[PDB]
Amino acid sequence: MEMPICAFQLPDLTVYNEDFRSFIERDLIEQSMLVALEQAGRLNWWVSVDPTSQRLLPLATTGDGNCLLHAASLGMWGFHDRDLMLRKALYALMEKGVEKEALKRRWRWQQTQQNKESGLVYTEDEWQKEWNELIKLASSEPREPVYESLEEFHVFVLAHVLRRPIVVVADTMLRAFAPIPFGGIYLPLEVPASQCHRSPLVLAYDQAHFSALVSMEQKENTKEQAVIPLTDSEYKLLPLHFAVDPGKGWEWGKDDSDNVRLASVILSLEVKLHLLHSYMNVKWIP
Amino acid sequence: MQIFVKTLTGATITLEVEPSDTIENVKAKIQDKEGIPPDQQRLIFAGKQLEDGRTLSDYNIQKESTLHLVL
Amino acid sequence: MQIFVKTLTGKTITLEVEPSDTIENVKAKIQDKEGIPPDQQRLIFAGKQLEDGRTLSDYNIQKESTLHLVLRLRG
Predict the structure, then answer these.
(1) Minimal Cα distance from B26: which residue of A?
(2) In this structure, are strands B66-70 and B2-6 parallel, antiparallel, or unpaired?
(3) ∠ CA(A220), CA(A226), CA(A228), 5° rounding?
(4) Where Phosphoserine occurs, residue numbers (chain B)?
């Protein structure tokens, strides 16, 4: 009868733009996304069951290909400086990052697991091709410059770039044609929790668009803190994206077929809760 | 009222407007979602170029109408 | 001929097709029916991720051949 939530604040973006707070109040609300995710029961379902919790509203999304990075700026000012800087940082961390070797293991393992659901078995060359494709999407090559849109794993890398957790509010199915992979929790697991921001970046996804989620009082700058639940409306724990790391001693051929080996790396509920409590302030409310 | 703004290669922008909204009001909204300054924006609807000082109703923009953004 | 594009949700999509068509053309057909961009589509048949360049003649096909559709959604 108790669900885990997280009391978050908006990122202190003073050093990037000293008037960022003013751009938040100035910013539009993505009314199309608000209505969609609310009527889908994904957004603001918690208001009725959890008092002392404000409604979350999506900031204006963009259409230049950097809506994910633009959400990290929470304002109009990101457009001609930061959004591209964050995109470049995203690319750099995948190509020459110090934790890129571990990020690749987390990506490949999850992709291998999800590949079973379709009977897909990648060759060693196809794995190389898919990884290169991910990095290519994070490039700053255009085609008003328009940049390539980003996938699920890019959100996970963004968490490492910002050095802060990312919680995405989204639907589970595509209007049910196909699964939507973006909803869930993204933790900078390759970065020590002590060196990360405590407050998570709360986002919303709808119709191939990303937007930052803020409360009304967080937008008018009258209250610093808001609440995001770490479960769905049915109180099932949110998916932890790329949380499993099989390790360097994981032989991709043999171990993936071994059910005993897979069980030894598949996270339990206790482990998942520990990871959440490590990078976020998780409060249990009745 | 809901309208759309299409570009040559970018995502489709969705705006919440009113028939009485001026073109400056729309450009200020587009700037918020595209990063293009209003004076560098050229808006086209039904072959008509939306000029500042006028409203959406002056070009008879309807519900679910689609504007075309270009530099 | 007639093929079926099956997704992870179980939705079956009956698509008009010919052996002359390539995977790029099939993904284009899916886009006209589902609105999903071809670059965000991965067609899998018999356990192999099909290539856009190769045709339906390159791989095996029939009047009841079922293909698996996997998406790589982008925001």
Answers:
(1) A28
(2) parallel
(3) 135
(4) 65
